[PDB]
Design a protein around this ligand. Structure first.
Ligand SMILES: [Mg+2]
Ligand SMILES: [Mg+2]
Ligand SMILES: [Mg+2]
Ligand SMILES: [Mg+2]
Ligand SMILES: [Mg+2]
Ligand SMILES: [Mg+2]
Ligand SMILES: [Mg+2]
Ligand SMILES: [Mg+2]
Ligand SMILES: [Mg+2]
Ligand SMILES: [Mg+2]
Ligand SMILES: [Mg+2]
Ligand SMILES: [Mg+2]
Ligand SMILES: [Mg+2]
Ligand SMILES: [Mg+2]
Ligand SMILES: [Mg+2]
Ligand SMILES: [Mg+2]
Ligand SMILES: [Mg+2]
Ligand SMILES: [Mg+2]
Ligand SMILES: [Mg+2]
Ligand SMILES: [Mg+2]
Ligand SMILES: [Mg+2]
Ligand SMILES: [Mg+2]
Ligand SMILES: [Mg+2]
Ligand SMILES: [Mg+2]
Ligand SMILES: [Mg+2]
Ligand SMILES: [Mg+2]
Ligand SMILES: [Mg+2]
Ligand SMILES: [Mg+2]
Ligand SMILES: [Mg+2]
Ligand SMILES: [Mg+2]
Ligand SMILES: [Mg+2]
Ligand SMILES: [Mg+2]
Ligand SMILES: [Mg+2]
Ligand SMILES: [Mg+2]
Ligand SMILES: [Mg+2]
Ligand SMILES: [Mg+2]
Ligand SMILES: [Mg+2]
Ligand SMILES: [Mg+2]
Ligand SMILES: [Mg+2]
Ligand SMILES: [Mg+2]
Ligand SMILES: [Mg+2]
Ligand SMILES: [Mg+2]
Ligand SMILES: [Mg+2]
Ligand SMILES: [Mg+2]
Ligand SMILES: [Mg+2]
Ligand SMILES: [Mg+2]
Ligand SMILES: [Mg+2]
Ligand SMILES: [Mg+2]
Ligand SMILES: [Mg+2]
Ligand SMILES: [Mg+2]
Ligand SMILES: [Mg+2]
Ligand SMILES: [Mg+2]
Ligand SMILES: [Mg+2]
Ligand SMILES: [Mg+2]
Ligand SMILES: [Mg+2]
Ligand SMILES: [Mg+2]
Ligand SMILES: [Mg+2]
Ligand SMILES: [Mg+2]
Ligand SMILES: [Mg+2]
Ligand SMILES: [Mg+2]
Ligand SMILES: [Mg+2]
Ligand SMILES: [Mg+2]
Ligand SMILES: [Mg+2]
Ligand SMILES: [Mg+2]
Ligand SMILES: [Mg+2]
Ligand SMILES: [Mg+2]
Ligand SMILES: [Mg+2]
Ligand SMILES: [Mg+2]
Ligand SMILES: [Mg+2]
Ligand SMILES: [Mg+2]
Ligand SMILES: [Mg+2]
Ligand SMILES: [Mg+2]
Ligand SMILES: [Mg+2]
Ligand SMILES: [Mg+2]
Ligand SMILES: [Mg+2]
Ligand SMILES: [Mg+2]
Ligand SMILES: [Mg+2]
Ligand SMILES: [Mg+2]
Ligand SMILES: [Mg+2]
Ligand SMILES: [Mg+2]
Ligand SMILES: [Mg+2]
Ligand SMILES: [Mg+2]
Ligand SMILES: [Mg+2]
Ligand SMILES: [Mg+2]
Ligand SMILES: [Mg+2]
Ligand SMILES: [Mg+2]
Ligand SMILES: [Mg+2]
Ligand SMILES: [Mg+2]
Ligand SMILES: [Mg+2]
Ligand SMILES: [Mg+2]
Ligand SMILES: [Mg+2]
Ligand SMILES: [Mg+2]
Ligand SMILES: [Mg+2]
Ligand SMILES: [Mg+2]
Ligand SMILES: [Mg+2]
Ligand SMILES: [Mg+2]
Ligand SMILES: [Mg+2]
Ligand SMILES: [Mg+2]
Ligand SMILES: [Mg+2]
Ligand SMILES: [Mg+2]
Ligand SMILES: [Mg+2]
Ligand SMILES: [Mg+2]
Ligand SMILES: [Mg+2]
Ligand SMILES: [Mg+2]
Ligand SMILES: [Mg+2]
Ligand SMILES: [Mg+2]
Ligand SMILES: [Mg+2]
Ligand SMILES: [Mg+2]
Ligand SMILES: [Mg+2]
Ligand SMILES: [Mg+2]
Ligand SMILES: [Mg+2]
Ligand SMILES: [Mg+2]
Ligand SMILES: [Mg+2]
Ligand SMILES: [Zn+2]
Lengths: 60, 112, 151, 206
RNA sequence: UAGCGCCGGCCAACUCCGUGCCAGCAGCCGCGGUAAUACGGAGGGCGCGAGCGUUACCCGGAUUCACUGGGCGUAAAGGG
RNA sequence: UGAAACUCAAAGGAAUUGACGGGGGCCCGCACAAGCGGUGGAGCAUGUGGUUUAAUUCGAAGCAACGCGAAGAACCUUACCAGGCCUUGACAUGCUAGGGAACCCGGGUGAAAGCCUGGGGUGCCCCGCGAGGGGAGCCCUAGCACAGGUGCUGCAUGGCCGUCGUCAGCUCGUGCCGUGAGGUGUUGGGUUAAGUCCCGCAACGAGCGCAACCCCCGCCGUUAGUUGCCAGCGGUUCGGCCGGGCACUCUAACGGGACUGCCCGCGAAAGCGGGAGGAAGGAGGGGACGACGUCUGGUCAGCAUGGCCCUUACGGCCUGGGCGACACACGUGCUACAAUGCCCACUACAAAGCGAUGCCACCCGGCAACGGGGAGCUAAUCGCAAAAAGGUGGGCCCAGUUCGGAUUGGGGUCUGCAACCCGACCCCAUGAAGCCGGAAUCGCUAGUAAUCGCGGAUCAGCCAUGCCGCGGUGAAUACGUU
């Protein structure tokens, strides 16, 4: 239940309640930011890759 | 460019850079022989030279190892007297074999 | 430029908290198959680098060898502390008969007929060192009469 | 056992955003999503030429797609086909205005993601790992460069036990910001499976 | 008529399946505890051939009883 | 004096590197000491062991597993369990065959999935005036190739991460030394946070580390004037509201500025001590940054991947259950045991941040939550906001109390199809153990601990006492290194 997992994650054949997020890449279910539509992990990779506009190493 | 900071050390280097090389720096090939004031003392050199089949010559007192010197200058070598006397005529010989013999540099006063 | 041939490439090692690292022995001989010969023993954290390094040292330490038609002048025994090696002259058609080490030596030496044996220890390294010295102590009839003259 | 991604570390400097534009709390999500898959399709059909960097720009249906390649000829074709067919197939799937610009690569031996994809291959093609890795460096260094370093990790030679082969020459201060050190990575599939590849190229400074 | 031994290292000859501290191998070191160039079969290879292997014993290697040709501070060995 | 059987693939010398020592020397880190507060007791929350179960999915294991994957489990999620149903598939590409276009609408059925099934419909290509058919897409159905697997192996592996440890270390080239493993350099004197630097030296130099280059905070100048300002005048529904100005505040870019530079002492130097000037000194405070390598660390359930295993099922759908079970054991936590306090009224001072079917100003109704109306705001313009502790006034008077708020009953709002299992909140009533906690043990060296609130990620709502961040009030104590 991982391929059919991610498909059902788009359809919502019923009540808007069963609507849940999903990492666009990894297809993770949890730790997914609404902003990037991505899981925490993959984004860490993209951020390092520079492939994320403005996204930059924070420090204070 | 070069902050005041870098200038300091960078120059300071040069000083000791010269403080050991100024007299060796004119050598660029690789000596044909080596003149040594006290053999036993700077015997480390003798070894370097000897291995490279570079001829050894040196002033040497009794505190010395006569066999490992190719051209020996037996005699005192701890006192300025014998040292200045030998190096004098030694160099004068070099200059004369070359061209333009002159008169020994200050050293007699240095002797005091 | 001469000929090149290594006798062995062993991996030594050393302890140190958290594990063991290794350098690399590498003994190599080099010669023109015509009297000029030189042995070399290089060390480094890399097999290639090691043999390469042995190459530099090889051509450095060298030795001419008095060859009488592919054989050696007189027989000699030379004990390098540990091990000991014999060397004997032999007519053409005898061949180089010896342990793998002294072979490399004598072969790249241009030698082609010789009876020999490794007595005592046998550590490749020490037998190597041993043979070099042995050749380095061979003397032609001349050398003899030349010293035994002193006119 | 740490080492952060040299790139992300030099984000506020040196390496600029490979994808660089702007949006808001509604667009960023998709523009990125699309931007990504575009780069993906390009990794696919385009790597055959030495596809290293792939810069991108957007804002309002405007879309830059400057793809830097070691062999531009393969992205162009003969005069307007290979280059165009992509422009087609690209927007043929995007609802936007594209532009498949193409730079060259004055020297691949000075681009990590290239050096990487290179040594990444020879392993797949089953070859001397030590030799090849060490050669890539002596290529990149001899190729004129202030520093270089390369490293694979996995089943070198196909052994049971894992491993990792080190190799580098000339300064490569990964800790310093003013450094610019092209970073490269690449996979390597074999009978015995996965195998990582890393590349580091110290170039600029100050 | 063409056979036999071997192909981890010494030692000349490499892959695949099976197997799974079992079945087994073994001269020394060691090999097999799911992925074995070391078991067993196969394909291929090295060696010899009316033979090829094994066991047994003798000399060799063994300068390991040393005459040739060894040793004895701490390695076995100076006698209280 | 002195064997043998038997048995082992060694026994053993010296030297080398390293680890270890209830050996040593020099040295360091909230390591101990000094000191403040706290867990272990109680209640509850949360994770875990165990047992239980139809199932209570799986992983993580001393330090470095246990509010950890999970930054949001009613069904979704969901990998588990029971029951119903499909079995080239929920998704990929391909080849081929018969029927229909596409598309939209429904009825019988059932728990839903799924299965029986009427209607509308007739677009685009070829031939022909039509008929009729053939060709594309798209669907039904047949078949093959193939899907799919959170099934197994982190002891096959990439990636990423933990860790020793921000420790000061690890090592290379050539030379030299040793038969060699190896040694030197890197050691030694001084110095520092530091293999920091000086000095010395059979080494001379170089590389990864340390520092420095990047971000935040402190003083100040430049540019910018929809924030702030009567600083300054004038009008005032006396509110920086209108005029007016940017000076100051602030907002954000850029730059100045500190370098043991200056003075004095010691010192071969490096450096050290003390003084000025200075917003700030001897690294000013906080961050990001974590070397060779160690742990057969972690993770095949993020993803990737060698091998293996499944294949009308080890795959897929739904409905319900479970993950929330409870005789128990521990780990992190929250609220407390009250007068340096609890209550109630009234009044004041932040920061960072978030918000256009989101933030919701004000009115109305309600004890209330919440509902009805409704202005503004893509936002230094309106909104979440009341910060809280504080301040002043009143009440309680030492009690299991007006301490403490668990448990239980009753009534109600809101999200979401749905709140039995299982949400969150409101109001009334009920008012538990607990009177400072055994052996034992954690945190912290200054704007720190303690304390007090505010925000944000996630997300319908929320089981958040959790996490990440923000500001407010603001200590104690370090003789010393046994
Ligand atoms: Mg949800
Ligand atoms: Mg999520
Ligand atoms: Mg990239
Ligand atoms: Mg010269
Ligand atoms: Mg010369
Ligand atoms: Mg003599
Ligand atoms: Mg005088
Ligand atoms: Mg030649
Ligand atoms: Mg020649
Ligand atoms: Mg060659
Ligand atoms: Mg040597
Ligand atoms: Mg060299
Ligand atoms: Mg001659
Ligand atoms: Mg000769
Ligand atoms: Mg002897
Ligand atoms: Mg032997
Ligand atoms: Mg031996
Ligand atoms: Mg000679
Ligand atoms: Mg001669
Ligand atoms: Mg590649
Ligand atoms: Mg190729
Ligand atoms: Mg990466
Ligand atoms: Mg045989
Ligand atoms: Mg044989
Ligand atoms: Mg062979
Ligand atoms: Mg069996
Ligand atoms: Mg089996
Ligand atoms: Mg096998
Ligand atoms: Mg095995
Ligand atoms: Mg065998
Ligand atoms: Mg076999
Ligand atoms: Mg055969
Ligand atoms: Mg015959
Ligand atoms: Mg015998
Ligand atoms: Mg015998
Ligand atoms: Mg005998
Ligand atoms: Mg003996
Ligand atoms: Mg004797
Ligand atoms: Mg005995
Ligand atoms: Mg006697
Ligand atoms: Mg007697
Ligand atoms: Mg005795
Ligand atoms: Mg007696
Ligand atoms: Mg006896
Ligand atoms: Mg006996
Ligand atoms: Mg008996
Ligand atoms: Mg240890
Ligand atoms: Mg502590
Ligand atoms: Mg501290
Ligand atoms: Mg204490
Ligand atoms: Mg307690
Ligand atoms: Mg308790
Ligand atoms: Mg536990
Ligand atoms: Mg029971
Ligand atoms: Mg698992
Ligand atoms: Mg478990
Ligand atoms: Mg959670
Ligand atoms: Mg079932
Ligand atoms: Mg299909
Ligand atoms: Mg066909
Ligand atoms: Mg219907
Ligand atoms: Mg009807
Ligand atoms: Mg058509
Ligand atoms: Mg057409
Ligand atoms: Mg046509
Ligand atoms: Mg047409
Ligand atoms: Mg027509
Ligand atoms: Mg027509
Ligand atoms: Mg017509
Ligand atoms: Mg018609
Ligand atoms: Mg068509
Ligand atoms: Mg077509
Ligand atoms: Mg592991
Ligand atoms: Mg790993
Ligand atoms: Mg250490
Ligand atoms: Mg060291
Ligand atoms: Mg050392
Ligand atoms: Mg000393
Ligand atoms: Mg340094
Ligand atoms: Mg100012
Ligand atoms: Mg006024
Ligand atoms: Mg006035
Ligand atoms: Mg006035
Ligand atoms: Mg105004
Ligand atoms: Mg300055
Ligand atoms: Mg000074
Ligand atoms: Mg002062
Ligand atoms: Mg600082
Ligand atoms: Mg700091
Ligand atoms: Mg740093
Ligand atoms: Mg591991
Ligand atoms: Mg494990
Ligand atoms: Mg797995
Ligand atoms: Mg796998
Ligand atoms: Mg796989
Ligand atoms: Mg099955
Ligand atoms: Mg079956
Ligand atoms: Mg509104
Ligand atoms: Mg309201
Ligand atoms: Mg009211
Ligand atoms: Mg409300
Ligand atoms: Mg309302
Ligand atoms: Mg305003
Ligand atoms: Mg909120
Ligand atoms: Mg109060
Ligand atoms: Mg009062
Ligand atoms: Mg009571
Ligand atoms: Mg009511
Ligand atoms: Mg009691
Ligand atoms: Mg009391
Ligand atoms: Mg909060
Ligand atoms: Mg929320
Ligand atoms: Mg909180
Ligand atoms: Zn992801």
């Amino acid at each position: 239940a991982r391929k059919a997992l991610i498909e059902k994650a788009k359809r919502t054949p019923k009540f808007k309640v069963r609507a849940y997020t999903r990492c666009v890449r990894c297809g993770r279910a949890r730790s997914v930011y609404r902003f990037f539509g991505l899981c925490r992990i993959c984004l860490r990779e993209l951020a390092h890759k520079g492939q994320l506009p403005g996204v930059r190493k924070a420090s204070w | 460019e070069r902050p005041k900071k870098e200038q300091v050390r960078l120059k300071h280097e040069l000083e000791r850079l010269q403080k050991y090389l100024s007299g060796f720096r004119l050598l660029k090939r690789l000596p044909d022989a080596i003149f040594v004031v006290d053999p036993t003392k700077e015997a480390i050199a003798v070894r370097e030279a000897r291995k490279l089949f570079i001829p050894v010559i040196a002033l040497a007192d009794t505190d010395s190892d006569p066999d490992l010197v190719d051209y020996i200058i037996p005699g005192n070598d701890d006192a300025i007297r014998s040292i200045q006397l030998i190096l004098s005529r030694a160099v004068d010989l070099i200059i004369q074999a070359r061209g333009g013999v002159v008169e020994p540099s200050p050293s007699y006063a240095l002797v005091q | 430029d001469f000929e090149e041939k290594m006798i062995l490439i062993r991996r030594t090692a050393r302890m140190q908290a958290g594990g063991r690292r290794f350098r690399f022995g590498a003994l190599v001989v080099v010669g023109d198959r015509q009297g000029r010969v030189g042995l070399g023993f290089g060390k480094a954290p890399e097999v290639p680098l090691a043999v390469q390094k042995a190459g530099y040292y090889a051509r450095r330490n060298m030795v001419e060898v008095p060859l009488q038609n592919g054989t050696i002048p007189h027989e000699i025994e030379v004990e390098f502390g540990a091990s000991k090696i014999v060397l004997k002259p032999a007519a053409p058609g005898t061949g180089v008969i010896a342990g793998a080490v002294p072979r490399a030596i004598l072969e790249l030496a241009g030698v082609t007929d010789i009876l020999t044996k490794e007595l005592g220890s046998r550590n490749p390294i020490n037998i190597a060192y041993a043979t070099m010295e042995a050749l380095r102590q061979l003397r032609t009839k001349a050398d003899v009469e030349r010293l035994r003259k002193g006119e | 056992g740490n080492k952060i991604h040299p790139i992300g570390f030099r984000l506020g400097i040196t390496r600029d955003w490979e994808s660089r534009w702007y949006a808001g709390k509604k667009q960023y999500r998709h523009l990125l999503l699309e931007d990504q898959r575009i780069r993906g399709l390009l990794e696919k059909e385009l790597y055959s030429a030495g596809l290293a960097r792939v810069d991108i720009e957007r804002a309002a249906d405007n879309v830059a797609v400057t793809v830097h390649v070691a062999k531009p000829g393969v992205v162009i074709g003969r005069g307007g086909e290979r280059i165009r067919v992509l422009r087609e197939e690209l927007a043929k799937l995007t609802g936007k205005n594209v532009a498949l610009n193409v730079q060259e690569v004055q020297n691949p031996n000075l681009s990590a993601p290239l050096v990487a994809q290179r040594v990444a291959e020879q392993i797949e093609r089953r070859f001397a790992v030590r030799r090849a890795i060490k050669q890539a460096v002596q290529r990149v260094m001899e190729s004129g460069a202030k520093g270089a370093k390369v490293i694979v990790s996995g089943r070198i030679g196909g052994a049971e036990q894992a491993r990792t082969e080190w190799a580098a020459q000339g300064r490569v201060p990964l800790h310093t910001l003013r450094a610019n050190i092209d970073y490269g990575f690449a996979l390597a599939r074999t009978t015995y499976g996965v195998l990582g590849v890393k590349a580091y190229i110290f170039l600029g400074e100050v």
